Curated annotation (Swiss-Prot), chain B:
One function term, GO molecular function aspect: fatty acyl-[ACP] hydrolase activity
Presence of keyword Protein biosynthesis: no
Protein name (database record): Oleoyl-acyl carrier protein thioesterase 1, chloroplastic
Chief localization: plastid
Gene coding for it: FATA
Span of the entire protein shown here: 75 to 359 of 362
Organism: Arabidopsis thaliana (Mouse-ear cress)
Residue numbers annotated as active site: 190, 192, 227
Length: 268, 269
């Protein structure tokens, strides 16, 4: 792992592990999601940001402010197989006072070809009250120095899947996985549920026959609210179509919305 | 990752990842368990065994036989922190017609000190009928060549914790975590539940206050039956004890069929 010559992006190589693959012997979409966040943490550590908080500036800690994921978008062309080396390059960019955006390019270490790409949208929030608030000028000066000033987008294309408004799934759902609880392995170092568990919980309502005959090409996920340690989640799916699905994660009780998203699958 | 000079053991170094640690910022016991199985797979791959199954010889595939975990024993002195490099050395040894044993030594890459150690007991079984059998002579000649012939035990000691008979938890249990289902992330490449998920499911019945004030020093787990994708598990715990001991039991939430039993030992922080 290391920063590029300009110190404006970071690269890391990962060997795919035995327990990180599914039935095809290729990395799962949660393994990829985990590698994206690990290379993101390493990029922030390599530019001065200390442990406890992810990329929280000196002003952010003083004011009890954290960066939170609002959206995650992932497109995979080829899933690296068990034993293969995947090289991921990541960088962060400012989007004015709306928030910040972090992008990734997944490549095959042997061929040099792009096998996948991802984009995430982060917003600033008070860790205690959970209130959003715009990006303050004083905090911008602190992190802008680590970001390229010119646009560098993993998803440049006019009208692409990463910015499309996601609708709310209507009842009754076509498919469903009810009673999902997180365990200690689903929690991060700060005792919150890691954003990767939501990806897995969304995919639990996808029927096994679709998973066996298709490969996940695209996934877009909107994070609305966090699931607490003692909360139970219900996963709902409906085919909207390649196969497309509209997804919805909600609390098993009150029916409070925690996540919404879409997936696109290709026939093998 | 590479075999030692004699080709009778294997070593690999691992950097501890951000998502692999708990509240203390040190690797969880499931992260360690995962690293032990990964270095075990890499050792078998480096000595000729194909990707298909784990260490299944040419005769084993012909007769639809596989190696299955019967017992797992793990002792941790220091949990490596996020960013630290942990070096693990592993090897396999025969235990006559009973089956095989695989051992591991966890070390700090910087200090060279032993920070942990583990031992597992494997038995031979038919893939389809699920019936156990002794290790055949023909099968033994095929894998004995990769094992040191002299004893090499991670847990040598006269009466150590790795061989102690585990009792069955009596009802009512003191603590419990009900309704545990595996998800796709809990399954391996062959669609079975990973043996590491059982470790996590056992620890779900341990109260949060014990986890917050103590560190897991020892864990012994006996694998009796596998949990299917559509099975629901119940985790039961009872304190049996400065150190805290617990008796554990995993069973199917329906019929109450026993799938796992074990013990843990925790020391105060
Ligand atoms: C490039 C640095 C490390 C300043 C940064 C800040 N970020 C906020 C949210 C997401 N990624 C981020 N990366
Ligand atoms: C050293 C080799 C690759 C022969 C081997 C066989 N095993 C059976 C059970 C557990 N580990 C094992 N390793």
């Amino acid at each position: 792992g290391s920063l590029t010559e300009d110190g404006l992006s970071y690269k890391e190589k990962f060997v795919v592990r035995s327990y990180e693959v599914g039935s095809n012997k290729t990395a799962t979409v949660e393994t990829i999601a985990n590698l994206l966040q690990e290379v993101g943490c390493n990029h922030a550590q390599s530019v001065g940001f200390s442990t406890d908080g992810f990329a929280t500036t000196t002003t952010m800690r003083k004011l009890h402010l954290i960066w939170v994921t609002a959206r995650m978008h992932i497109e995979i062309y080829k899933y690296p197989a068990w034993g293969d080396v995947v090289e991921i390059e990541t960088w962060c960019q400012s989007e004015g006072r709306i928030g910040t955006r972090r992008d990734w390019i997944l490549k095959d270490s042997v061929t040099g070809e792009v096998t996948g790409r991802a984009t995430s949208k982060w917003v600033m929030m008070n860790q205690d009250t959970r209130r959003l608030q715009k990006v303050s000028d004083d905090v911008r000066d602190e992190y802008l120095v680590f970001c390229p000033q010119e646009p560098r987008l993993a998803f440049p294309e006019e009208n692409n899947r990463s910015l499309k408004k996601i609708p709310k799934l209507e009842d009754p759902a076509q498919y469903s996985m009810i009673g999902l609880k997180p365990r200690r392995a689903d929690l991060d170092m700060n005792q919150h549920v890691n954003n990767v568990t939501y990806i897995g919980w969304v995919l639990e309502s996808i029927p096994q026959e679709i998973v066996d005959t298709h490969e996940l090409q695209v996934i877009t996920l909107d994070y609305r609210r966090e699931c607490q340690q003692d909360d139970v989640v219900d996963s709902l799916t409906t085919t909207t179509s390649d196969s497309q699905f509209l997804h919805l994660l909600r609390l098993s009780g009150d029916g409070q919305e925690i996540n919404r998203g879409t997936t696109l699958w290709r026939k093998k």
